[PDB]
Amino acid sequence: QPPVPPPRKKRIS
Amino acid sequence: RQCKVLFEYIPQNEDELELKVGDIIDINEEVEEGWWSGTLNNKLGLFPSNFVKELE
């Protein structure tokens, strides 16, 4: 099955 | 360190790389669990690590 992207919380510092 | 894209990824945020099956990404660093920065076609952006396989 195709993967589900994890949630994002952060931009690159 | 390099990885190969196993699954397509259509970005959800403008700082994320668009991925196509077979792309090779040069890995930079972990931003947060599951999300790494890397370079692809001279672009630096974020990508989801469960979409790729790390190469030797």
Side-chain angles (χ1 to χ4, degrees), chain A residues 2-13, chain B residues 1-42 44-56:
Chain A
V4 180
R8 285 190 56 208
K9 293 82 110 267
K10 286 186 180 188
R11 286 168 181 270
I12 298 175
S13 281
Chain B
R1 304 170 62 174
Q2 298 166 288
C3 62
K4 181 175 195 82
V5 171
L6 301 180
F7 296 98
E8 186 164 39
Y9 182 68
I10 302 172
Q12 296 172 257
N13 294 278
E14 61 82 29
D15 60 345
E16 297 169 5
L17 296 174
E18 182 171 272
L19 308 180
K20 298 297 183 201
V21 176
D23 284 336
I24 305 297
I25 302 168
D26 291 358
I27 302 162
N28 187 34
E29 57 190 17
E30 187 192 79
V31 175
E32 64 182 314
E33 184 178 338
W35 280 99
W36 287 62
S37 64
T39 52
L40 174 58
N41 300 315
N42 208 41
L44 188 148
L46 287 167
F47 67 92
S49 60
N50 59 336
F51 292 54
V52 309
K53 181 159 181 182
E54 199 167 341
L55 292 163
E56 312 174 47

